[PDB]
Amino acid sequence: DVDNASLARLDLERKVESLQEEIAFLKKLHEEEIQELQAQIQEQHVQIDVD
Amino acid sequence: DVDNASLARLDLERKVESLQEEIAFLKKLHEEEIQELQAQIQEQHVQIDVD
Amino acid sequence: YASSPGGVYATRSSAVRLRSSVPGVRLLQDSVDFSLADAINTEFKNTRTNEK
Amino acid sequence: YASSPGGVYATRSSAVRLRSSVPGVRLLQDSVDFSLADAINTEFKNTRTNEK
Amino acid sequence: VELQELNDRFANYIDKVRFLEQQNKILLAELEQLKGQGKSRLGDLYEEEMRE
Amino acid sequence: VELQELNDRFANYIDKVRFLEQQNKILLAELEQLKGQGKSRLGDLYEEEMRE
Amino acid sequence: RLQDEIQNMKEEMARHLREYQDLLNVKMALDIEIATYRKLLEGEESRISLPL
Amino acid sequence: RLQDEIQNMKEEMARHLREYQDLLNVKMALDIEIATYRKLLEGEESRISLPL
Amino acid sequence: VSKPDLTAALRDVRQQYESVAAKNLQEAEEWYKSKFADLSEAANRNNDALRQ
Amino acid sequence: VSKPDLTAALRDVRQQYESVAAKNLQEAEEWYKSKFADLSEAANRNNDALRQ
């Protein structure tokens, strides 16, 4: 129960450790999803004189 | 090291409680981040383009 | 127009080699750049720019 | 002419952190409100709703 | 040409409306990540401060 | 005013440059909110929670 | 844990440069289509105005 | 288990290298989109005798 | 009328479709986080199965 | 109709399709990374089952 109780600690902590690196990874990828939005704003340059 | 680890099992009941409200602040952050994307889409485009 | 007020940067601290064990009860940080929210703070204001 | 220094030195200290082998550091993790930031998010909705 | 200068004053008054909205839109974008995410990222940080 | 439709046709072509300078300024604030939140701030936080 | 997020990074980042490039490719396609329009509409405003 | 924690911190450093270069690609995108809105604007200076 | 018409609303619909492409990209970063969470939880569960 | 203008909005629908198609490839990339974590930590679990 040193091994079992500290491994029951670790088997959950490694899941949250992996999920927090995956949230950091999904957020450094969501930087590229906001960069496709910034690319739309960069392409709107485009159109003609109004009235 | 098991008395440490079994008290450490009760630490994950507290840390999983704490991280479930962190993941609730992060879900609220995604709902504010989606409102901010819809604000940014309206904010970049009402000036009428290139002219 | 000066960078680093007071000359500041993160200078190396390194102390006495204290071997404490630390059982490492994490604050997880769901704001590891919640950043989609701060691009969205710029879009809570691009939404104001288009309406204006 | 506004020469005014808007940058104040947010004064950091880190004197050399001795052997903290005293274990009596209780945990507390008290955060974040910050309800003024949700008031400011509501003032950004209100300022857009005025701009509309 | 007062009829055509009236369209060209429509353009120069639409510039003045495009700037009225877009100086609000730059100010909403340079704020909304400091308001809405400006409370959610403050709970996100207080749970990291709560973790240590 | 054959020369004021004129200067204001030239003005709406300069104000086209102001419309792109404003849309490009919301873009270049949103691009700094993008970099500041997405990879940096959200990485900087959850890389310390993963260490805890 | 290192490989899944360093590959999520390596794949996302080789996509984000291309995703910004493709928002800027939509902007480029709009620039050509806006030319084909401009050289005809603002290019009949030409006999008051002109193109590219 | 320290190579997990260290190489995950070097993943997020290696991700922040590519994400800071994504923010430089948002800058460099705005540099060329400003430049190519200038390649519109010779033709929009032509398009009313107007934005140089 | 000096103003044409609808020409405003068509450019505002244009820049709102370019903003809705940016909103769909913002929500596709919530999709990207969701698949990065599928990865992070698969990496945790197989880690806790090999720690077991 | 003196210049088509709508041809820009049809390119922004195309840039939305190309952006969403690129993010759908990144959703698949993170699912392939999830499977690479499954396979790599299964190979580590087989090296530990050989110790067991």
Residue numbers in the entry:
A (entry chain 2), B (entry chain 1): 209 to 259
C (entry chain l), D (entry chain k): 53 to 104
E (entry chain z), F (entry chain y): 105 to 156
G (entry chain AJ), H (entry chain AI): 364 to 415
I (entry chain i), J (entry chain j): 260 to 311
Paper excerpt:
Intermediate filaments (IFs) are integral components of the cytoskeleton. They provide cells with tissue-specific mechanical properties and are involved in numerous cellular processes. Vimentin is mainly expressed in cells of mesenchymal origin, in which it assembles into extensive, dynamic and hyperelastic filament networks. The vimentin tetramer is the basic building block for subsequent formation of unit-length filaments and VIF assembly.
To this end, we polymerized VIFs in vitro from bacterially expressed and purified human vimentin, and imaged the filaments using cryo-EM. The resulting 3D structure of VIFs reached a resolution of 7.2 Å. Comprehensive power-spectrum analysis yields a helical rise of 42.5 Å and a helical twist of 73.7°. The definition and initial folds of the vimentin domains, namely the 1A–1B (residues 86–253) and 2A–2B (265–411) domains, the linker L12 (254–264) and the head (1–85) and tail domains (412–466), were based on the AlphaFold prediction of the full-length vimentin dimer. The initial folds were adapted to the cryo-EM density map by molecular dynamics flexible fitting. The cross-section view shows that VIFs comprise 40 polypeptide chains, which are partitioned into five octameric protofibrils. The frontal, straight tetrameric α-helix bundle (red region) accommodates two antiparallel 2A–2B dimers (green to red colored α-helices). The lateral, curved tetrameric α-helix bundle (blue region) accommodates two antiparallel 1A–1B dimers (blue to green colored α-helices). The N-terminal ends (NTEs) of each 1A–1B dimer position the head domains to protrude into the filament lumen, where they interact to form the luminal fiber (blue chains). The protofibrils are connected laterally by interactions of the tail domains and connected centrally by interactions of the head domains.
